[PDB]
Amino acid sequence: RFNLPPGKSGWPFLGETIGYLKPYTATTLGDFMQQHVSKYGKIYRSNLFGEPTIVSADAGLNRFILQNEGRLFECSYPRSIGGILGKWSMLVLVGDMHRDMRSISLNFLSHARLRTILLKDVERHTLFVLDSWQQNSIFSAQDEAKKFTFNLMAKHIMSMDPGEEETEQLKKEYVTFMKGVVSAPLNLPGTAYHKALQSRATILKFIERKMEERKLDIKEEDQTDDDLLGWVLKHSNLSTEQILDLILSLLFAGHETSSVAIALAIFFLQACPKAVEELREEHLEIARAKKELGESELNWDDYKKMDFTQCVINETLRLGNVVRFLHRKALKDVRYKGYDIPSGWKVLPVISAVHLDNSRYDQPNLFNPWRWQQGNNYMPFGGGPRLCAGSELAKLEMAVFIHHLVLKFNWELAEDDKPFAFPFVDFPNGLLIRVSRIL
Template identity: 30%
Template sequence: MWVLMAIIFGMSIITCLHALKYSKYNSKLPKGSMGFPILGETNHFFAPNPSFDVSPFIKHRVFKYGPIFKTSLVGKPLIISTDPDLNYLIFEQEETLFECWYPETFKKIFGDQFFGSLHGFMHKYLKNMIVNAFGIECLKSMVFEVEAAAITRLRRWASCEVVELKDEIANMILDLTANKLISYDPENSPENLRENFVAFIQGLVSFPLDIPGTAYHKCLRGRKRVMRMLENMLEERQQNPRKQNEEHEGILKNRKNKASGITWNEYKSMTFTFKFLNETLRLANIAPGIFRRALRDVEFKGITIPAGWGVMVCPPAIHLDPKHYVDPLAFNPWRWERCEGASKHFIAFGRGLRFCIGADFAKLQMAVFLHNLVTKYRFKAIGGGNIVRTPGVQFPDGLHVEIVEKE
């Protein structure tokens, strides 16, 4: 009895302090609910959503409070924006009104000095390093590698009765990207990078409860294994730096016709494929939120975003807005004949200073894979394909496909 009374009293004190802390902004803050003290509305935010549509958490609050509303997630006050104009301001005024920011759970997973949290000179320096690896000029020379990876995997899958396509494509992309960045060789590595990477990614947007069995706990364990693997690889590369490019250089030397395969010009001419990819990215909404933090009080359309508050831009609400996309849940690549690939209404790769550096590399991999799949193989879905957002995208029963080489 005394314990229960103590808990109730403690929660009451926290609630009062919680209200007093932001009382000076109450008249100008966006409408919304801060939920329970400490917990906030975290449990509603992470509730599973078996649909491509905007999550009920966002939908309900937009209907009730409008396109900009306040909430509290994982103990932090947060403003969520589904307003294209505010999103544009947030992205375009980075380092002036806003800065890149992630919840504390991200920092515990990535560390204090991870690339996404850096600002100013260090961010620009590291960004230039990555651009050198995945910029347009570099990608022109990578078309062969990307196509070779796609051809190898498709041949392997065609020899199987059924393929779990989601996992296999993820393996292909991760292996190619990791090989480019750190010379990762899945055949000769003592540990499975993807297995650890999947646990790592699934826990990024999960409830931060570090007990065995939770996604967050698996994420932290995956992080430790990935870091150990990277440390071992870097140590090996320091001992033998030339090893990095031997395999690909050998492949290029042994090719009889170095002009064979997809050329860069052919890739750039795939205009309908790019429409197809844009529509896929619009519906998939891989990133459920993009985080920033106000550097000072920001006034917008009569509301105030207090300095220090986090802001979450919500791409799904933008990409599935019926005011801009007619019949938004329908897969319709032809809509991109009228829509712009980069606008306030399409932010699949972010925007502004933090626009995804790997966007062109991702498009190259997807386009080249699709080209080889549709021109050389027939395929049909066998089972699976259901999705669940928590809020990240998951396929609980996979996507099972039969792939057969064309005669």
């Protein structure tokens, strides 16, 4: 194990971030962005992730970039990220195989499947986590949200059941694996990146074992495409290596961001009692109607009643900005507002910028869910051809979690030392809270 001389952790300039809100990280993104925008304006150049880079806090340019994917710009992560996610990870791929994998993901996460299958299981996994919560006892809201979102995705990707020893161990392995993307890409014994590469090998071996079992399942039930692993084996022509990277990546994407989104909602709501009251009123009415009909499990009609919840969700994503920026590269010389973006340079559209623009939002730094009672100024899931394939599941997860959360608990920050300080919220300790049962 190398004893490297001390120094700043993570990527140069930004610290431990690759563009999204990651709990438990040491990040300087907020100060970097505010200082450069103040000094150079909304479109400036720097050197980030090892390359000359144009950073865009300009809403028009960000829209222009996302809409011109494949023609003027393309998704482009640092090459070191390929070692973590794999050569066939759709999150970093462009071209025909990305198109095929996006089509798989859109089928896996379709509206039809949300209504018929995923909604029932979202509630089950929500209650599984919430029923274990104890009162008056400090814990990480982010950790608990990640338990929920990971269990849900592990169930529907590989049929793994919540709380089973193998499911908890895989989740722990993902912690080490995912830290690799925000670490300095130093492949030396003892570094977070090296450990992340080891975790990748461990996870890939686990997934391939599950794949061998599913191949037997398919053969036996011939003489089973319920989970994504079975579906891809039967309905796609992906190679083993491509199946492995796809599962690895969807399980990553399927629980990293949605857990943070739920933690952000918990954070914003504890500071806005009026919103909690209106949520409780909304979800109490939903429960009353279901009791009046003798129903016990949520259905799609219940979800459609959650009008103010959707306002809370929209406002949580607008102000919390799970995704701060995306990774692009110019395919040609591009001119915008008189500036030249050279061919081959990295381009980082800071998509959170339009969300905090006081030209687009009255009091953009204020958590005001009622603004959505009265998108082009709203892009927490991106835009253009790579728009989040799991956006509707993410909102369903937040809404169902909030539904049971506000019916069952009050909550409070571990200490009253956490005010929302523009521009970016960080969760260096995983949002510690305490709950009290409503009874």
